């Protein structure tokens, strides 16, 4: 079953995997983010209200004055979208906020406020986003891409190698907040704990340990455990468990219960440990020498005077033992002193402490943060609390604490943004665990650490910055607030936040201009992921780990489509079925699999969790009942892929399509070609340009419909119904009874878009593709845009191509082209330029736009109006007058202009046509300042603008008023029906049917007002519109009126253009060849494009071969249809023929027939097949060799696809059969007329007497440095002198040479390079003395 709209033409499809999921909305990211950013959600949940409740309320510090938030509202935009783009203003909308101001009583803080104030306050405006996901700033379109940055959390890096190369690895711990100072933990070869704050100097951890109010004993108890000793008479007996004897050599005779288990020196394996564990006693006896290097834990003090017997982190000596045993504190708590399980780094870390006191630590960090300042206790405390306790200057998002708890193997989900003490204690503990060896570090390229942002949150961040700035200002003002002396907006300013958001949208490394040439670029330039901008790395901070792709990128980030050159892998694209998780991670779908059956339902899975499960390869032979015909299948695990059993996998991939990007999915037969070749093919395909008339590619992928529909570059039926009127300007559609709204629905109007300048000087256009009075179905196309036809995407065209070397004209890759294509004008393209003339109000005479110009001929005025502006439709060429703008150059001194002079000379400043380009006037735009004279031509242009601006409204009201008149007809059925005056009295005029009933007139009079209201809204819409056209335009100061003109040029193919296909085949057209010499077949048709077969071996792209055979098959059906339809045969002949055509597949899900179809439906379907058969192909499940072979059998072509050919010049057989067929050719917008350029003598620069640069100015090329050394490599000397002295720098030399050359005496003069004289000046401008010397 198919809709009638699909029945325009049905596409042959292949493939055996039955799809289940539909392609989602291709603009979900931007739409969801912007919708979430502006909507009335209670409790915020990442919204504007969240930022408001963060910044609010505002309280005067001890001033007992409170400003508290109420609500915000937005009004309608004052302008439209289209004329807003035309004019130049942004498409913003006002921000209306209600603020509540109260002042507490000075006698009672908690007491009630004396008064309450509330009012609506306006501040700034914010840009709006159109359904296509666009933005408007200054009469243009700009788009913000999404940023990709590391998530706020913890990282652990190896950094093996460079430092102390003949040494083992290091380790480091990093914490990055969402907004705040960085904090770094790292190691050194001497193995000490050091901390660094914000890339500053290296400091030990002990300073912050003590500054966190910890004593040494507390710290050592934290990082270490106890080993207890006793002052005992017999050798100080002591207690040991074998857990600390795991893997040590016996430094003692192992004895217990008076029985030695093993002697000194024997390594204690597991067997001896277990032997100890049988009747495991702990108290044993050891000699004394072992404690020589061992370190006490606590701080034992004397009892005679209180002196400290031994402090922490120092070892013990025999005298210490003796004079602590003299005191009798038997319990001796010592340090564990492990080597391979608990590295005692804390010991020497505390030993190299510079200080020992909290106040000293505060003073030290005080001088570390700000050098050269007097140490103050309170200032140090204030800065320390303003780094990790201050919720203002430091904070974490909920995602930050989420990953923090996940990384530390914690279980808490929700806490506070600010950090604590025990958390960084745990960071210590985990870091020292890692240094011990156990545990595992984390990489960076893994996507479970990668976070994606979008427009809403960065907009919220910039807006929050603006609000905190203005809040600072408001509090500063409120410090001197008075008793209810003002209304609560004099303290607020709309300037700062408006300026901030305007700068963010205007100037940003994320708000790039958008390349508007074709819908493919439209859809692929929005779903783009970048890693640049603030908070991320730059273009050359990139190593190699960021550059290469990672296994986690599968199904979430396209690996094959990315720009190449200066930046690779930094501008990666997002997948086709991927989506954004709630937190800000990526997600990809999977099919749930039961014990032996796969369910239809799906799950969305994050990046971190997928390692816990195993996923099967997509193109597995799933059985009819959801089983696997094999008992074993390859499946990708957390690490790699491996063949697993029948019952090991639990999730199935949705389809083969979810591996690549949108642009990549459009390349047919992709699986047969190399990665880099496909990459360059996609990079070219994104750069195509629509031609004059589009035509569907013969080989498609099935994705054309989705991208065409979702990208709003075409007219879509908001409601289905019946066509009523169609035109090249507007479309009128009848609404069906079920779909119309109960309250005065009426009909819909669709305004088309005509020829208009695009962002890339291309012709955006909309052609209707619907006949008259056709039933249209809900959500379907009506009018085709550029490079689109009948609702499918069509960039290039289809050519008859052959692969053969011919007379060297295809030497490397040069594309030979037949004359027939330019004969048909089938690659003809259009460009639209833009020329601007300003009218400033400067001194020495305000500028005039008069038609009077001196020193010119009458040829200009022959093509000019008395206003000076060109008439519409003039065949102007380069260097022609367009607008006539001219600027002029007591009682005794002012009259000399007549006595000794003649007249003031007014200087011409006419904007001419740039040289080299033709064109024709298609549109003139004139803007005027507030209160300036409007010349004649400007008056009619608004008059033509005026009368059309009221016809469309009148046409709208005429249809709009029709609905209310049916209400008259339905009520007033019976009565006096007029024979002839039924129409002379129109559908409205029935309350004047001579006499009228006493009750019928009531409804007639009642509705008479509502027509007037419809007239009233007609009046206001007229009155509002007539003001917009009549009102001026605020501009930059000084200028008075804008003169915008438009040109249209018809660009043809000429030798030098840049041609390309869909499999990476580059090329430039070398020679255009007349028809007679082209090769041709026995049938009589010629061939159009001839290529070089040598591309296939070197660059392995066999895919372009396989499509070419299909092109013959696609035409091979079509011409056979064409052969039969030329003679009027009965319909069932083609009906069975087309039936077998859409039959003849291996195993497909298409399963279409023709019996159910009406005869006229089949006939109109036949004529759309006059050009061939559109054939679909999935990216990986495409057609194999066999079914291509048997498809040609239905045609009348040889089985091999291999055809002998006849020569165009000599006309004989070729003793090798050649391969011909079709191939999809598009055109790039890299022409030759815009590149070829030269100068002989033009302008020069001011600071140096050197020629200009660039083609826009009449400038030349740059003699690069590199060819300099190249030139003396040959014995050439004079040219080096001659090129850079007499042609570039010397001023007297060239003029003599210029005068000398016109006489033939070619001679050179040395001169002296003035640039060197420029050099000596500034080096003189310092204390340096330098000059020339003796001659």
């Amino acid at each position: 079953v198919y809709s009638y709209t699909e029945k325009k033409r049905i596409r042959k499809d292949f493939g055996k995997r039955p799809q289940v999921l539909d392609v989602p909305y291709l603009l979900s990211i931007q739409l969801d983010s912007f919708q979430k950013f502006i909507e009335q959600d209670p409790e915020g949940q990442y919204g504007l209200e969240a930022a408001f409740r963060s910044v609010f309320p505002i309280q005067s510090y001890s001033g007992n004055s409170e400003l508290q938030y109420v609500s915000y509202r937005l009004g309608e935009p004052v302008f439209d979208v289209q004329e807003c783009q035309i004019r130049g203003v942004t498409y913003s909308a006002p921000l209306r906020v209600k603020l509540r101001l109260v002042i507490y009583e000075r006698e009672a803080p908690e007491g009630t406020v004396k008064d309450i104030k509330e009012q609506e306050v306006y501040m700034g405006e914010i840009p709006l986003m159109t359904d296509n996901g666009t933005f408007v700033i200054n009469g243009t379109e700009r788009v913000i891409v999404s940023q990709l940055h590391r998530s706020p959390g913890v990282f652990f890096d190896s950094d093996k190698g460079k430092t102390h190369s003949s040494g083992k690895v290091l380790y480091n711990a990093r914490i990055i907040p969402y907004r705040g100072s960085w904090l770094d933990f790292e190691f050194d070869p001497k193995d000490n704990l050091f901390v660094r704050i914000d890339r500053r100097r290296k400091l030990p951890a002990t300073i912050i340990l003590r500054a966190l109010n910890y004593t040494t004993e507390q710290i050592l108890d934290l990082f270490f455990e106890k080993v207890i000793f006793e002052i005992r008479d017999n050798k100080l007996q002591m207690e040991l468990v074998p857990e600390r004897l795991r893997g040590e050599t016996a430094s003692f005779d192992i004895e217990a219960n008076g029985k030695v288990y093993v002697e000194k020196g024997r390594r204690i394996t597991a067997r001896h440990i277990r032997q100890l564990e049988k009747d495991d006693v702990k108290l044993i006896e050891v000699p004394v020498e072992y404690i020589a290097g061992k370190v006490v834990a606590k701080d034992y003090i004397d009892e005679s005077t209180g002196e400290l017997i031994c402090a922490a982190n120092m070892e013990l000596s025999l005298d210490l033992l003796a004079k602590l045993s003299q005191s009798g504190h038997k319990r001796i708590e010592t340090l564990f002193t492990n080597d391979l399980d608990h590295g005692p780094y804390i010991s020497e870390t505390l030993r190299v402490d510079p200080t020992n006191d909290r106040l000293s630590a505060l003073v030290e960090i005080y001088r570390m943060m700000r050098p050269g300042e007097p140490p103050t206790r309170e200032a140090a405390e204030s800065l320390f609390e303003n780094l990790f306790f201050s919720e203002d200057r430091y904070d974490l998002s909920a995602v930050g604490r989420m990953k923090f708890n996940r990384s530390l193997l914690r279980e808490e989900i929700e806490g506070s943004g600010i950090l604590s003490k025990d958390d960084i204690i745990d960071v210590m503990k985990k870091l020292i665990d890692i240094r011990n060896g156990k545990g595992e570090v984390d990489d960076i390229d893994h996507l479970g650490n990668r976070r994606i942002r979008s427009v809403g949150e960065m907009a919220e961040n910039q807006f929050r910055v603006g609000l905190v700035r203005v809040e600072r200002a408001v509090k500063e003002r409120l410090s001197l607030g008075d008793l209810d002396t003002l209304m609560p907006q004099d303290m607020i300013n709309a300037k700062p936040i408006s300026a901030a958001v305007k700068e963010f949208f205007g100037s940003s490394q994320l708000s790039q201009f958008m390349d508007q040439n074709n819908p493919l670029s439209e859809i692929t330039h929005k779903r783009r992921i970048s890693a640049l901008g603030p908070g991320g790395l730059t273009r050359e901070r990139a190593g190699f780990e960021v550059r290469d792709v990672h296994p986690t990128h599968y199904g979430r980030v396209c690996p094959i489509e990315t720009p190449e050159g200066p930046n690779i892998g930094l501008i990666n694209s997002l997948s086709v079925y991927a989506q954004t998780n709630e937190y800000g991670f990526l997600e990809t779908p999977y099919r749930k699999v039961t014990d032996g059956v796969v369910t239809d339902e799906i799950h969305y899975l994050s990046a971190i969790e997928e390692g816990n499960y195993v996923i099967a390869q997509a193109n597995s032979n799933l059985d009819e009942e959801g089983h696997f015909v094999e008992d074993l299948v390859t499946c990708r695990s957390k690490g790699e892929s491996s063949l697993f059993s029948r019952d090991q996998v639990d999730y199935m991939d949705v389809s083969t399509q979810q591996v690549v990007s949108v642009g990549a999915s459009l390349i047919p037969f992709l699986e047969h070609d190399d990665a880099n070749r496909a990459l360059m093919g996609a990079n070219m395909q994104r750069q195509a340009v629509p031609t004059l008339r589009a035509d569907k590619p013969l080989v498609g992928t099935g994705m054309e419909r989705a991208v065409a529909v979702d990208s709003g570059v075409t007219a879509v039926a908001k409601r289905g119904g019946v066509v009523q009127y169609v035109d090249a300007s507007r479309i009128v559609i009848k609404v069906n009874e079920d779909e119309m709204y109960p309250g005065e629905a009426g009909i819909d109007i669709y305004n088309l878009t005509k020829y208009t300048r695009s962002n890339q000087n291309t012709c955006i256009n909309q052609m209707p593709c619907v006949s008259l009075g056709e039933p249209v179905e809900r959500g379907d196309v009506l009018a085709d845009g550029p490079s689109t036809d009948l609702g499918e995407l069509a960039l290039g065209q289809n050519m008859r191509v052959a692969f053969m070397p011919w007379n060297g004209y295809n030497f490397e890759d040069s594309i030979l082209v037949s004359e027939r294509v330019v004969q048909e004008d089938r690659f003809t393209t259009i460009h639209i330029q833009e020329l601007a003339c300003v009218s400033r109000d400067t001194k020495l005479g305000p500028e005039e736009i008069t038609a009077d110009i001196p020193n010119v001929g009458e040829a200009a005025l022959s093509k000019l109006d008395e206003s000076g502006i060109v008439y519409i439709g003039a065949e102007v060429t380069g260097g022609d007058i367009l607008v006539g703008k001219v600027t002029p150059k007591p009682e005794e001194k002012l009259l000399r202009a007549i006595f000794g002079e003649k007249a003031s000379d007014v200087k011409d400043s006419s904007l001419r046509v740039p040289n080299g380009v033709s064109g024709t006037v298609i549109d003139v735009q004139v803007f005027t300042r507030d209160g300036v004279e409007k010349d004649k031509r400007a008056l009619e242009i608004e008059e033509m603008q005026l009368k059309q601006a009221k016809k469309d409204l009148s046409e709208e009201l005429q249809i709009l008023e029709a609905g209310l008149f049916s209400r008259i007809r339905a009520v007033l059925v019976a009565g006096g029906v007029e024979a002839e005056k039924l129409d002379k009295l129109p559908r409205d005029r029935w309350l004047e049917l001579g006499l009228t009933d006493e009750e019928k007139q009531n409804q007639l009079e009642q509705l008479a007002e509502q027509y007037d209201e419809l007239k009233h809204e007609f009046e206001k819409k007229l009155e509002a519109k007539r003001r917009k056209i009549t009102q001026g335009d605020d501009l930059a100061p000084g200028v008075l009126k804008i003169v915008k003109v438009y040109l249209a040029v018809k660009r043809r193919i000429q030798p030098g253009d840049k041609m390309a296909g869909r499999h990476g085949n580059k090329g430039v057209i070398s020679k255009i060849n007349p028809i007679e010499d082209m090769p041709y077949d026995e049938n009589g048709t010629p061939v159009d494009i001839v290529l070089n077969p040598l591309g296939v071996p070197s660059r392995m792209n066999i895919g372009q071969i396989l499509e070419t055979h299909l092109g013959m098959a696609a035409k091979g059906i079509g011409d056979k249809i064409n052969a039969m339809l030329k003679q009027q045969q009965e319909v069932a002949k083609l009906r069975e023929f087309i039936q077998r055509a859409y039959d003849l597949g291996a195993d497909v899900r298409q399963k279409v027939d023709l019996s159910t179809f009406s005869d006229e439906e089949v006939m109109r379907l036949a004529e759309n097949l006059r050009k061939g058969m559109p054939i679909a192909t999935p990216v990986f499940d495409g057609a194999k060799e066999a079914e291509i072979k048997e498809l040609l059998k239905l045609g009348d072509l040889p089985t091999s696809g291999q055809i002998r050919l006849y020569d165009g010049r000599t006309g004989e057989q070729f003793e090798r059969p050649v391969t011909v067929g079709y191939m999809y050719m598009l055109k790039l917008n890299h022409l030759v007329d815009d590149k070829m350029h030269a100068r002989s003598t033009g302008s020069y620069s001011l600071v140096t007497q050197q020629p200009l640069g660039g083609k826009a100015q009449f400038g030349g090329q740059r003699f690069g440095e590199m060819e300099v050394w190249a030139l003396e490599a040959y014995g050439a000397a004079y040219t080096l002198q001659e090129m850079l002295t007499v042609k570039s720098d010397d001023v007297n030399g060239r003029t003599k040479m210029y005068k000398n050359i016109v006489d033939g005496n070619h001679q050179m003069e040395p001169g002296m390079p003035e640039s060197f004289n420029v050099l000596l000046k500034e080096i003189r401008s310092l204390g340096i003395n330098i000059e020339l010397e003796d001659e």
């Binding site: 290469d548 792709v549 050159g565 690779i568 390869q617 083969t656 047969h672 880099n676 052959a802 692969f803 053969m804 070397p805 060297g808 490397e812 890759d813 040069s814 000084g1038 000429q1054 030098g1056 430039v1068 057209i1069 070398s1070 070089n1092 077969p1093 040598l1094 071996p1097 070197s1098 392995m1100 071969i1105 990986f1180 696809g1201 070729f1214 003793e1215 090798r1216 059969p1217 070829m1236 350029h1237 100068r1239 140096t1248 050197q1250 020629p1251 090329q1261 740059r1262 590199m1266 060819e1267 300099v1268 190249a1270 040959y1274 040219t1279 001659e1282 850079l1284 570039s1288 210029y1298 016109v1302 006489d1303 001679q1307 050179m1308 640039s1315 500034e1322 310092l1326």
Partner: protein, 552 residues
């Protein structure tokens, strides 16, 4: 700079000078007042820092910014840096009388000449036009000549043609790498909008026709013209300064044409006659009464230089094919006939050129190269060496070879699940057995493809060389090598992890058949690694070249 209205975005130096002069004015004013020491030393401090920043900025903390957000420029910035004065205005400076365009082939020119589009030709030589117009006196003032050349009257194209006849020009390639990147050509007027190049120069330029663009320059004086025709010329540069091997070696198409030209199937129509000269062989081929190549005895005359400065003729009845003789028809006198009896590969033709230069001077070598290029295009167009999908014959035994391979991988796995072996040992030996399988499949497909053609041979049967298009393109040395066909037809080897570790599962598919997702993903790994490698390597290469050319 005069900008819109009374606004002028002037240089930062003006701001620095204004700041320091205001500072000095305030300071010298306040010392008149006998001010207290604290404020005067504060002013002297801030003046000192101001003038220090004026001399050099960035050497102090909190470098003073400029207009909005960036550190202002200084004199030290004006002297040093890539944006400084040296490397943008002294070592390299923009020059007039130049131009730029895009390249095409136009493979019918001579090696000592190049084309040039008509409008460019008119634009470049305007002073020469004025001079010659004065010489014939058809104009009087500069204005008359200017309006005549702007009208593009037909009476000036003949002068324009006259001033070209031997007036040379220069060409340039923007990433100029070595000394051959600059050459000179005798220009010839051509219609169009693009530059035309002789094909044999693009190899030296390493300039593919993908859309590279050239620059042009015009020598002016007699010194310049003689200097250009002496050393800038393309003719007198045929050996690379890096190595004595030549630099006009043919690249892609003429080599294919000649390689196809000198191959002989054992049986073909027109086999087994005798001819007395290459001329009648050419006539017979144009008649179509004999094959392009078949074993034919011919009478060949050859010259040789045994005499010290003189040539000696001698005749014989050699045995060869027709194509060898018809190629011999154009070869110069010196070389012996034995120089063409081989298959004329890439190395062979390079040796041809080298020997011709070493024995027969310079000019005959040049004309020989030009004429062999002409014949190469002619017979390459005549051949019709197309490509076809049916060409790539896949070997059949490879399937059961693979089947055996997973048999031993299952076997080694089931030893490993019994504690017999460790992970590393099994890793190494599965790599070994997979590599051995690759060797076997590669050798099998090579022997299947290499000589598949068979013929009855005027009788029972005979086995000879192949005639597949892929093979003849491969062994010609034109494009690709053995590994390309190995990748395409046979197994695509085995790829490694990004770190460098090898994947245990090899690429068991090939481009002619379909490809599953994961192996394509690994191929993406490899390709992205290579592209990143070259993209990063370019900058280091250029920088190293700069330092080395500076040091010596």
């Amino acid at each position: 700079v005069p900008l819109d209205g009374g606004r002028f975005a002037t240089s930062d130096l003006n701001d620095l000078y204004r700041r320091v002069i205001n500072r000095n004015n305030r300071l010298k004013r306040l010392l008149d007042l006998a001010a207290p020491d604290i404020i005067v030393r504060n002013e002297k401090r801030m003046l000192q820092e101001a003038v220090d920043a004026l001399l050099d900025n960035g050497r102090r903390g909190r470098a003073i910014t400029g207009s909005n957000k960036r550190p202002l420029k200084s004199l030290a910035d004006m002297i040093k840096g890539k944006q400084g004065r040296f490397r943008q205005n002294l070592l390299g400076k923009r020059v007039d009388y130049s131009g730029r365009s895009v390249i095409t082939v136009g493979p019918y020119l001579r090696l000592h000449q190049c084309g040039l589009p008509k409008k460019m030709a008119l634009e470049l030589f305007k002073p020469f036009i004025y001079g010659k117009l004065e010489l014939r006196g058809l104009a009087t003032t500069i204005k008359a000549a200017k309006k005549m050349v702007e009208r593009e009257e037909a009476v000036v194209w003949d002068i324009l043609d006259e001033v070209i006849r031997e007036h040379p020009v220069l060409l340039n390639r923007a990433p100029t790498l070595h000394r051959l990147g600059i050459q000179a050509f005798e220009p010839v007027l051509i219609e169009g909008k693009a530059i035309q190049l002789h094909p044999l120069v693009c190899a030296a330029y390493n300039a593919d026709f993908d859309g590279d663009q050239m620059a042009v320059h015009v020598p002016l004086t007699l010194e310049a013209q003689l200097e250009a025709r002496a050393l800038m010329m393309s003719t007198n540069n045929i050996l690379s300064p890096a190595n004595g091997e030549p630099i006009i070696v043919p690249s892609q198409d003429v080599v294919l044409g000649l390689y196809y030209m000198t191959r002989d199937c054992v049986n073909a129509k027109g086999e087994g006659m005798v001819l007395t000269g290459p001329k009648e062989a050419e006539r017979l081929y144009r008649s179509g009464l004999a094959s392009l190549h078949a074993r034919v005895k011919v009478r060949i005359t050859e010259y040789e230089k045994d005499a010290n400065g003189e040539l000696v003729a001698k005749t014989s009845l050699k045995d060869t094919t027709v194509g060898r003789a018809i190629l011999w028809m154009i070869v110069p006198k010196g070389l012996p006939y034995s120089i063409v009896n081989q298959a004329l590969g890439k190395k062979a033709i390079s040796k041809m050129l080298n020997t011709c230069y070493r024995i027969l001077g310079l000019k005959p070598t040049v004309i020989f190269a030009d004429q062999i290029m002409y014949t190469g295009f002619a017979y390459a167009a005549r051949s019709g060496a197309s490509v076809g999908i049916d060409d790539m014959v896949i070997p059949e035994k490879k399937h059961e070879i693979i089947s055996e391979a997973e048999a031993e991988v299952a076997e080694i796995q089931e030893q490993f699940q019994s504690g017999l072996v460790t992970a590393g040992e099994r890793y190494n030996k599965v790599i070994d057995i997979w590599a051995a399988a690759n060797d076997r499949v590669s050798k099998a497909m090579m022997d299947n493809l290499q000589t598949e053609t068979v013929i009855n041979r005027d009788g029972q049967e005979e086995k000879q060389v192949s005639f597949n298009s892929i093979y003849m393109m491969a062994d010609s040395g034109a494009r690709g090598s053995a590994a390309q066909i190995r990748q395409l037809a046979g197994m695509r080897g085995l790829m490694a992890k990004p770190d460098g570790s090898i994947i245990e599962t090899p690429i068991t598919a090939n481009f002619r058949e379909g490809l599953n997702v994961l192996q394509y993903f690994i191929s993406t790994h490899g390709a992205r690694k290579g592209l990143a490698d070259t993209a990063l390597k370019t900058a280091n290469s250029g920088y190293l070249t700069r330092r080395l050319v500076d040091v010596a």
